[PDB]
């Protein structure tokens, strides 16, 4: 039931409608920040509206995830990173979230080497059920002034969906995995 | 000439193979490598067709460009990076290149803070004409194991299109600009 739209083609009221719905959906200090919204921009949005109202949203945005295999090689994987997955609270538990992820996984499978996200510890079983793989190793970020810095807080949160890895590569989820730099939450 | 815009994930197999075949030839060790094709995926494609065959391609993919302002604050700018802009040999100088860049710039203005690209020499006038800023400072890449490494080869090639810079950001082309890491040509 989800409509796929590039940030590009969102009119002002859809952007404001989506942002307002996502900010409210992540309230149980505003949990969903300006940086969190920046992270949701530049890729494909999955939207579900009912009678003029936005009731569901998700985004998949491109970045690189860094992974070194046991042959020592080093890979910068073309990643579809899942952001701002949200359903208006009264509309939850009726398959809308599923419909949003169904549409984002179509993007990921069609365009990227790997899907990734850092799930709220509440949503973790929903991803595990879709066949997303929990990372077991240490997580880190490639910083511009320090080098690769550990992100222990994101170790339990990181999920991957390896859709089309290069060469022979099969990930070992016990190895380290490193995200590229951005402001706010790196994961 | 009007380009149609399509996400990587919506390309049918024949159009994907068609685009890569046309782009490899337009750039003709082949000059257009497997990494070069990798770099053109994950974003929006501009396509122009004629007599059932592709005559023009380009792509805009999301990455981060790192820039430090005169107030010492580091920015990780949401970048629409332009890749694989190509017009079939027999169709050059009819404005097809212009139509491709018009559609990609629609994406960049609609979704990103900055546009960037590392132009071949033959393409340079086309960018200078469209009002892309030539960079005058040193360029670098953020590497995983060596920190920020100068990319002197790319100093003369870099164009940016600054469309929606964060508050308090004066883009000075004399200063250093750093791309995020990827395999192959970092720029
Ligand atoms: C997480 C969220 C998007 C789920 O959306 P939803 O429309 O309730 O979910 P669905 O009905 O499609 O179900 C998602 C899965 O969660 C579980 N689930 C079952 N009932 C549920 C309910 N009422 N609410 C949430 N999850 C439920 C099931 O495993 C379900 O899979 P199913 O469709 O096979 O039953 C939504 O609750 C939300 O917006 N939460 C707050 C913001 C947030 O945490 N989202 C992103 C975290 S990474
Ligand atoms: C993309 C490419 C075909 C240029 O496309 P094109 O169809 O020749 O370009 P257009 O006709 O749209 O315009 C090219 C520009 O050349 C310039 N130009 C126009 N007439 C010219 C002339 N007589 N002499 C020289 N330059 C001229 C103009 O700036 C023109 O833009 P405009 O027509 O909007 O004014 C060329 O870059 C290419 O395909 N080469 C191989 C692949 C490649 O190197 N691409 C690199 C992208 S970085
Ligand atoms: N008052 C409600 C709050 O909800 C919060 O909900 C969760 C989310 O806000 C956030 O979830 C993860 C986080 O686990 C992980 N370590 C970092 C990751 N970037 C966050 O990401 C998630 O939430 C943010 C919005 O905050 C979204 O931008 C992002 O797309 C989404 N996947 O962190 C929280 C998980 O600890 C918290 N559980 C807690 O602060 C509190 O219960
Ligand atoms: N060597 C001079 C000329 O190089 C041309 O080819 C150029 C392009 O192939 C390539 O241009 C730039 C490059 O300058 C810069 N330092 C790095 C950047 N990634 C390259 O990028 C460009 O070409 C590659 C394809 O190779 C594309 O994938 C990319 O999208 C495109 N903008 O590098 C070459 C140097 O400018 C032509 N083969 C020919 O006119 C002539 O040989
Ligand atoms: Ca947050
Ligand atoms: Ca090349
Ligand atoms: Ca080959």
Author numbering:
A (entry chain B): 17 to 44, 52 to 210
B (entry chain A): 16 to 43, 52 to 210
Task: Provide excerpts from the study.
Three different classes of enzymes are well established: ATP-dependent phosphotransferases (O-phosphorylation, APH), ATP-dependent nucleotidyltransferases (O-nucleotidylation, ANT), and acetyl coenzyme A (CoA)-dependent N-acetyl-transferases (N-acetylation, AAC). Here, we present the crystal structures of an AAC(2′) from M. smegmatis [AAC(2′)-Id] in its apo-form and AAC(2′)-Id complexed with CoA and different aminoglycosides (gentamicin, sisomicin, neomycin, and paromomycin). Collectively, the kinetic results indicate that AAC(2′)-Id has a very broad substrate-binding specificity, similar to AAC(2′)-Ic9. AAC(2′)-Id was not active on streptomycin because the antibiotic does not contain 2′ amino groups in its chemical structure, indicating that AAC(2′)-Id exhibits strict regioselectivity.
The chemical structures of both neomycin and paromomycin contain a different linkage at ring II and an additional hexose sugar ring (ring IV) compared with those of gentamicin and sisomicin. Paromomycin has a hydroxyl group at position 6′ of ring I, whereas neomycin bears an amino group at the corresponding position. In contrast, the 6′-hydroxyl group of ring I of paromomycin exhibits calcium ion-mediated interactions with Asp54 and Asp59. Compared to neomycin, paromomycin forms different interaction networks at the positions of oxygen atom of C61, leading to metal ion (calcium)-mediated interactions with the enzyme. This interaction may explain the higher binding affinity of paromomycin than neomycin in our activity assay. Paromomycin has the same chemical structure as neomycin, except that an oxygen atom is linked to C61 of paromomycin, while a nitrogen atom is linked to C61 of neomycin. The nitrogen atom linked to C61 of neomycin makes direct hydrogen bonds with the side chain OD2 of Asp59 and the backbone carbonyl group of Asp54 residue, whereas the oxygen atom linked to C61 of paromomycin forms metal ion interaction. This difference in interaction might explain why AAC(2′)-Id has ten times higher catalytic efficiency for paromomycin than for neomycin. In the case of paromomycin, rings I and II make multiple interactions with AAC(2′)-Id, while rings III and IV exhibit only a few interactions with the enzyme. However, three ring-containing aminoglycosides (4,6-disubstituted aminoglycosides: gentamicin and sisomicin) bind toward the β8–β9 loop region and make several interactions with this loop, whereas four ring-containing aminoglycosides (4,5-disubstituted aminoglycosides: neomycin and paromomycin) bind toward the α1–α2 loop region and make several interactions with it.
